[PDB]
């Protein structure tokens, strides 16, 4: 259950466009990472920032149950997809990445974390 | 002024677009067609998902803000900036597509800040 989590999180690392991915549980912890080992305590807490603010948007504007977020800057995008309950996948991208695809391949990898995990 | 409406009318008649509204960035209502009573409470609430989308564009080092996305099993909620000082919020359905009314707001939103 382990080796195959650590490994298929790092292979998004391989997509043109995509710096790093982490697996954060919802209360903003770190599950597993190969982003820089300074910043993966304050990456895992702003992570779990948008996911809260993005159930926000669903529920008060009645879009139903919370799904996925993006956030395009200047410099790059931010991506995140729930893992069902209890956990989450970002992605950072830079602003020539391929958006809707890889949501595409962030939705089939969730479900297969969710199993073995 | 008359030319700021009806060219937020028109963004309904595409596919899969249940709504738009043009709201300030302190959380007051300009023009939108939505039910009249909801319309200052959804001014109110994408006030927030804008500030709270500066606040990733500004702690993970991504630049400006220009646009924010969220998808719910029923829905999306899409907002993109209208330069300063405004923002244009379009509630679509979870079967419309997003790349094209992306392309179409970013347009508008750049034909509503001269004439605003």
Same mark, same amino acid.
């Given at each position: 259950?382990? @080796? ?6 790092? @292979? ?7 710096? *790093? ?27 779990? *920032? ?11 504007? @009645? ?9 395009? *800057? ?44």
């Amino acid at each position: 259950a382990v @080796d195959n989590i650590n490994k298929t999180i790092r @292979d998004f690392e391989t997509v043109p466009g995509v710096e *790093g991915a982490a697996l954060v549980s919802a209360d903003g912890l770190m599950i597993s990472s190969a982003l820089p080992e300074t910043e993966q305590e304050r990456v895992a807490a702003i992570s779990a *920032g948008l996911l809260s603010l993005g159930e926000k948007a669903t529920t008060e504007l @009645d879009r139903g149950n919370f799904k996925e977020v993006y956030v395009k *800057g200047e410099k790059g995008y931010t991506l995140l997809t729930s893992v069902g309950e209890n956990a989450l996948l970002l992605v950072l991208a830079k602003a020539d990445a391929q958006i809707g695809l890889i949501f595409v391949d962030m939705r089939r990898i969730a479900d297969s974390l969710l199993e073995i995990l």
